[model samples]
Target: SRRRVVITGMGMLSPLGLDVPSSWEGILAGRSGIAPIEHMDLSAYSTRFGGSVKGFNVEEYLSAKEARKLDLFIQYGLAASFQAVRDSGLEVTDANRERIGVSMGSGIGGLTNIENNCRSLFEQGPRRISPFFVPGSIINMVSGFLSIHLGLQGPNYALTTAQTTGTHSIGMAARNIAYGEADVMVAGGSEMAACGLGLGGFGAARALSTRNDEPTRASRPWDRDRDGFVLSDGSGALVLEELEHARARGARIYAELVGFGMSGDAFHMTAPPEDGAGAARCMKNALRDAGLDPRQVDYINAHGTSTPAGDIAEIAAVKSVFGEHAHALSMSSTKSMTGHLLGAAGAVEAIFSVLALRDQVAPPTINLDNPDEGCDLDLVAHEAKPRKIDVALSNSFGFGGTNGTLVFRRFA
Candidate 1:
């Protein structure tokens, strides 16, 4: 029989901080990472503010030669990837590399790389363009590069579910291990879209927060004054080991992957159903998968993007799914702090939820001063609180109507 999957180690590189401890600290303090675009000159764009990973030194994560050849997203993956492997405390070698694999995600792969290549081709002609452009920016290279960087050779792949990329990738990895395809999987997501085109494209769609005056308070998910998502950069990784396998190694366990449910709204390409049925069903199915009642859930990390349609629907969805327990559950959107990590959001949010189990400090939803009347459920609010949380549900809904809710239980 296939084995149960559990998270043994985790890592994060986001606007919150570089690693687990610092990131969790900022989250609990209600510190927002959203800010004016600093990765590039965004003076010309309407949607000028976003969250970006700061002060990264690739040398610390990758070799000098490798660092020069990859884009920021890939470099971010390498950084988190290294941290996860080290944190796992496992002796991985050529002997066991075949049993270990990687499943990372990126909603948009190497986008900045593509933009830079366009500039190079137009400015200096194609002859001057570097040949590493394709591999460097290719989305799947996230897993490929990770395999190379960490010597992971088992069932390596990358998922692209737009915003659900991270959660879906993790779901896929769990499926792989559940079906006996691999024993251990390095799974997560990364994205670096703070470049010119990244901001320009999203701004063109009017999808980004324009809170230039108060970037810190811009991404107010579930708030009445909420605007739009702030495109952020970062990466989050986790080491998923077979439950029994981890136990035999005396590994420090954090959470068990109790359930994962994926859904396609099929309602609209970019818009979700007004009824929020998709979101509701997603949570219900995940609960069923875990064989746990809704009351068993202690907290929820919502995909409340602060968008006009999104926030309202997400809250309604939760009310319907959790029913009477909606009043008892603590639900919040960490995106208010991290902005939207895009492909990396789910993984990082899952990390946040799991740590909430570890520390009993639920991360706050900042900028929620003006409560949206329509979103009546407990929005988790702007302050962190003490709670006895043992199980968490992290939700992600993508532009393609791809939705996922992952249930994680605190290790007993």
Candidate 2:
């Protein structure tokens, strides 16, 4: 028999707030975190606003000496991981340390590092760059730094699959524990890619919203006036443990990670296939893995990044997978408030879905005044709604045409 897996702890550092509680509160209150970019100069770019993590003090979680050697992404990841481990009360001892692992990733890795160092290389020389440059920028360093800090000795790695990085990391971490390779795993994604290249590249591709005049009202998913996604920076982490191990320690179970599905569009580099068949199949695969029918899913934390094609395509995919039950379930994009965290989005939104199950309150899709054609689902628009959520799903689709779905069932 397969060992069961449950999420026992959650952590977050996002534009909406510094931690999970504050972030969820912002979501419930229909608040938007998108604002003018403050990290760097964006006067040259078309889109000047983004969802930047504000009021974050890395020194609060890391010593100044220790933090000086790491990138912002690593700092965010470690902070989130510390929060999760502390929240779960999972002590990493010699006997059990080997069974604890980490799966953390960053979609854009250290773009800030790359951008800054490249400038240093050109303006100064190779010798002028900081020695920490190489280790700071690598994608795998988040998990590497985390494992060493927390003494996690089991499976340790990172996923770099664009936007699906977080979801895939969580799902794969659960698989690691479920298959008995480890008893506990810290899993999530972190990103601090709001640099010149990060913003300029997306702006050049027209992937970012140009609503410079109305930053908070920019990320309007499924709305007819929606333009594009607003980028952001943050980290979200979760602790997944074996059911028996958690029970042995009397750990508080947040939700059961029952299903995880992944698929590729195989038709486009950045755009999802026009038919959304791959996305529909991904949800179906996750349901099949969970052994639950479509009707059992009470809510979906949509991958709706407020993009034009991507928003409607997900609705079509959900309708295809859920059929008549599609209209019965409440789905919303907390990204409406948090903006798009890219690699960190899945883990953050997963926490929101779990919170929805716990609080029985569905967060609204804010700024959704005008619904587009075929976007007529019950998105819990503009206001919070109270509803029992026995099972909730979260979706994450990335630039490489990769997609991931996760199903969280209430632990009764």
Give lDDT tens digits, candidate 2, residues 1-412.
Answer: 5799999999999998889999998999999999998767788999999988899998878789988888888889988888888999888899999999999998988888788889999999998788999898898887898887778889999998999999999999999998889999999999987888888899999999999999999999999999999998999999999999999999999999999999988878899875678889889989998999889999999999999989999999988899899999999999999999999999899999999999998899999999999999899999999998999999999887899999999997
User: Model 1, range 1-412, lDDT digits (tens) per residue?
Assistant: 7579999889889998989888888999998877776556777898777887878888887778987889888988878878888898978887789999999889997888899889999999999787999899988887898887678889988998888988888878988888899989989999998887788888899888788998998888877787788888899999898898899999999889989999888888998887788888888888998989899998899987878888888878888887889888888999998989899999898888889888886678888888877677677788997898988999999987899998999888
Whole-model lDDT per candidate: 0.86, 0.91
How far residue 194's Cα lies from its native spot in candidate 2, in Å, is 0.5
Give the C-alpha miss distance for residue 112 in model 1, angstroms: 1.1
For each candidate in turn, give its C-alpha RMSD to the true structure in angstroms: 1.1, 0.8
